[PDB]
């Protein structure tokens, strides 16, 4: 379904990479934060929902599902917060490793990996698939 | 044209709001930074280009057009960096003012305004128009 997203967390270099995957296409958005908190997750969802038509988010764990702050952001943004990827984290870490030496900051390497992941043709790319899926829904 | 974006800067509360407008649709992405620098602009463009198919960016001023750091990000992301909105800044500041009391942080009010701006039906919204324009290009 065009509006379904899945949250995902992974660790790297003492930091956390928070990822949102558009389930039907494999398209991703990602950010680097010091640690996963309800405030960081709520702010990340608010950003994602202003950029794509987010109908449902499958939270990554029970703490984010429980968080009053995350629930408040889902309420504000009109998101249906729902309850309950390893290959995606491994592939994303693999791309980060291939670009790591071109970037001083981890956040720069992570955005380079988001770019490569979304543009990779598998032939359509994930960026093309998300747009085609949502335009068909309009 | 589907791949053309325009950068825009505005000031609020001692901070800078950096905006990227998809010219054909009026869709926006925005971020709050302490001040406009070549590093912040380069990082913002790298994020935008991993999320949308960015072919051309009309920089907001000569400093960003000149910046070796911005040029390096445009080279990395495959963006054609080009040279040379008031109503958009005024409308965005108007929305920020209507939500300002619902947010402690300026960045939260700015993302709420990006959400409202992109979802507002004028009837299609800017979020629907950007997706339809890019899907037609695919
Ligand atoms: C000086 C500098 N500092 C930092 C901290 C970063 C990155 O951080 C942020 C700026 C916040 C994204 C980082 O995390 O590494 C830089 N980028 C590295 C990543 C890149 C996306 C390529 C943008 C520049 C650069 C930099 C500047 C210029 C540069 O120039 C190469 C020759 C070049 C010049 C012009 C061109 F058009 C093409 C290549 C190389 C690196
Ligand atoms: C405690 C708190 N601190 C901060 C700093 C922020 C914002 O910052 C970030 C978290 C980083 C985005 C800010 O900048 O103001 C908050 N949000 C305000 C903005 C919002 C998008 C609604 C998310 C929560 C909240 C907060 C938490 C909970 C809350 O709950 C209402 C009743 C409620 C509870 C559950 C619901 F499902 C619906 C309403 C209200 C405000």
Domain limits, chain A: 1-138
What's the CA gap between B99 and A77, in Å, rounded?
13
Name the burial class of residue B115, with classes exposed (0-12), middle (13-18) and buried (19+) by CB atoms within 10 angstroms of its CB. Answer: buried
How were these coordinates obtained?
X-ray
Which residues, including other chains, have CB under 8 Å from residue B93's CB and lie 6 or more apart?
B10, B12
Opening angle at CA A59, ends A54 and A65, nearest 5: 115
Cβ of A127 and B53 within 8 Å?
yes
Q: Measured from the CB, is residue A43 less than 6 Å from ligand 2?
A: yes
Chain A residues inside the 8 Å CB shell of B135: 131-132, 134-136
DSSP A116-138: HHHH-B---BHHHHHHHHHHHH-
Class of domain B1-138: alpha beta
Pocket of ligand 1 (CB under 6 A): A 103-105, 108; B 39, 42-43, 46, 68-69, 71-73, 75-76
Q: Is B75 on the interface with A (CB under 8 A)?
A: no
| Selected residues 20-49 of chain B with any CB under 8 Å from a CB in chain A | 29, 43, 46-47, 49
Cβ of A52 and B127 within 8 Å?
yes
Torsion of CA B122, B126, B129, B135, to 10 degrees: -170
Distance A71 CA to ligand 2 centre (A): 8
Contacts from A80-87 at CB under 8 Å and sequence distance 24+?
A: A80/A55, A80/A56, A81/A57, A82/A56, A82/A57, A82/A58, A83/A58, A83/A59, A84/A58, A84/A59, A85/A6, A85/A8, A85/A21
Token pair, residue B59, equals 């920089």
Minimal Cβ distance to B127: which of A53, A115, A136: A53
What's the CA gap between A109 and B121, in Å, rounded?
36
Strand-pairing partners, residue A21, are A6, A28
């Amino acid at each position: 379904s065009p509006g379904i997203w899945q949250l995902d967390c992974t660790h790297l270099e003492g930091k956390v990479i928070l990822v949102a995957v558009h389930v039907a296409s494999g398209y991703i958005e990602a950010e680097v934060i010091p640690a996963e908190t309800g405030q960081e997750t709520a702010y990340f969802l608010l950003k994602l929902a202003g950029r794509w038509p987010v109908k449902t988010v499958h939270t990554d764990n029970g703490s984010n599902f429980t968080s009053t702050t995350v629930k408040a952001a889902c309420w504000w943004a009109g998101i249906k917060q729902e309850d309950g990827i390893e290959s995606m984290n491994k592939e994303l870490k693999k791309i980060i490793g291939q670009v790591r030496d071109q970037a001083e900051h981890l956040k720069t390497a992570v955005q380079m990996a988001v770019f490569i992941h979304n543009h990779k043709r598998k032939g359509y790319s994930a960026g093309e698939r998300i747009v085609d899926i949502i335009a068909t829904d309009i």
